[PDB]
Subunit: 212 residues, 2 copies
């Protein structure tokens, strides 16, 4: 039972935000504790996630994922809030940003289609908040770069924000609208509940990322 030995390949399912948050420190720990195992990832959208996890082709899934209900074990890692993001020298955006200012400024939206993060557009729209979306993008990769050279502002998850704040010189403010908490859970299928390798790996996840 000494990890350094293993030469296994784990398949991990996560969103783009996930990958960017989870992966850098997972790779650190793997380098000193199990430097011979191989990780590959993939978007939950891409497949029958359910079917893939059942037939063992996907060892673990990170994220929000409501569909994963019966036959899946679940473990809570952290809750995070939607947060308002803009560059650090933004000439007008205040912290805490007010609900009025949040209407007047120009935004970049992220569609985040079929994720938890796509709830956002609709909840705002329904609170009566029409944002001037000068830019709409399908995913998050660009927000750092865009916000950095522009006066736009984005609605973003707090753990994404904290990744982007030093690299791109941005700041955060609590979100002036009422948005739900997004809860990042870890999922495995019942069959791999007592698989030594699986347990080990998820134990690692909970150690690095569990806020308890």
């Amino acid at each position: 039972m000494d990890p350094f030995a293993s030469t296994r390949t784990f398949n991990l399912a996560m969103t783009d935000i996930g990958e960017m948050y989870f992966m850098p420190p997972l790779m650190e720990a793997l380098a000193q504790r199990a430097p011979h195992i191989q990780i590959s990832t993939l978007r939950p959208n891409a497949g029958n996630l359910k079917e893939d996890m059942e037939s063992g082709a996907v060892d673990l899934a990170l994220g929000l994922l409501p569909e994963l209900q019966t036959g899946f074990f679940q473990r809570r890692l952290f809750r995070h809030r939607y947060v308002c993001m803009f560059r650090k020298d933004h000439p007008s955006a205040k912290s805490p940003m007010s609900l009025k200012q949040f209407s007047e400024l120009e935004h970049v939206g992220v569609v985040a289609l079929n994720t938890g993060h796509g709830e956002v557009d609709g909840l705002l729209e329904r609170a009566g908040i029409k944002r001037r979306m000068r830019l709409v993008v399908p995913h998050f990769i660009a927000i750092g770069p865009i916000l950095h050279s522009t006066d736009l502002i984005a609605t973003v998850p707090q753990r994404f924000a904290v990744r982007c704040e030093v690299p791109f010189g941005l700041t955060t403010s609590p979100h002036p609208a009422k948005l739900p908490d997004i809860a990042i859970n870890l999922f495995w299928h019942a069959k791999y509940n007592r698989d030594p390798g699986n347990m080990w790996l998820r134990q690692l996840f909970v150690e690095l990322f569990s806020e308890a």
Copy 2:
């Protein structure tokens, strides 16, 4: 149109790499030249781009895009060389990297399905090059943060690399294997060659982005 007064939505097609490189400077320009139009973007490997572009649902596409052939126009904007990338304080990694060292080190791979960045997997593999892949990922979002935290190296488009260097503490090296250059093209359908709106934006792409 009156670019300033215009109110039009442009639908644009690009890879996550494209978004990252094109979007910031583009927004910075629309701010001054056309502050009331809305850009929306999407990926090429979704919907039916050929049919959508012909339809009018998609106004322009950027990237390699071989399938777009008749009825579609193009214009080369630039060719980027692939390059080698790793964190500034890396122990082994040296610039210029030896082909031998490139194999001794561990990599993170981007699969990047149906982009010109898919040929890499095989190009290198068919050139008789073996590389130890500790991590494999569907796209680029996490590439910068991963290299920052670890000792992995990556095979990446030079332009991605310059956008990454300073935020994530990274340096590059001419790639020590024979890889080709990769052409990024501005595309559009024949129905919209003479469209005043489409023309104007295309011309703005040519202005901001063309190596010539």
